[PDB]
Write a protein that binds this DNA or RNA. Sequence first.
DNA 1: TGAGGCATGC
Length: 212
Amino acid sequence: GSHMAGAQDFVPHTADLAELAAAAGECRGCGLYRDATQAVFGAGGRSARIMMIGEQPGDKEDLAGLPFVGPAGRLLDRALEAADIDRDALYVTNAVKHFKFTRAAGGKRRIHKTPSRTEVVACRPWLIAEMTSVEPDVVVLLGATAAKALLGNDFRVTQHRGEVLHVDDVPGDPALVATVHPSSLLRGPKEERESAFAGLVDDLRVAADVRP
DNA sequence: TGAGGCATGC
Ligand code: SF4
């Protein structure tokens, strides 16, 4: 890449998810490996028919080494239940595999920082390897960073959420459904939260109803 | 504390 080397040559030629996950722990495709605790690879099995892709680890994901374990993951768990999506059908990952954060000079708390488009493009080869291994029927794009990673920078989740989409550039031609990131339900006003949760559930139901 | 899609800064 122009700013970052990219992950492409760190990605081993394999569909084994465990081998991919170990190799991501050695990735230096961008700068984010340096300050992060560990790579946070996807969770689930190749038999999954629904792949869900978030933005990046948060604080709790970085410490645990698993995706969607913090507050946003708790919300996602409730939305999955409300749509009767069995977790055995899921492979869950993020567009970026190492936690990007900063700290105030006189503070200790790690402050989440949105990955740059540069870092998203650098990390995308891992996502392509995951999609090739899992071959999902449908991909849920949880938020703008993930949706733009596969649908292009001009894509707007608030414009096209809940629509079943297909693009050429994507291995295996799965259906794609974009929605808002579960953390946005928390970031927004408490009085919009109920309607926003119902909207996430409705978008998940669209994805769950995709028939290959 | 935990987005999104516009903007401005260097
Ligand atoms: S964020 Fe992705 S590309 Fe960057 S170092 Fe980590 S695994 Fe590699």
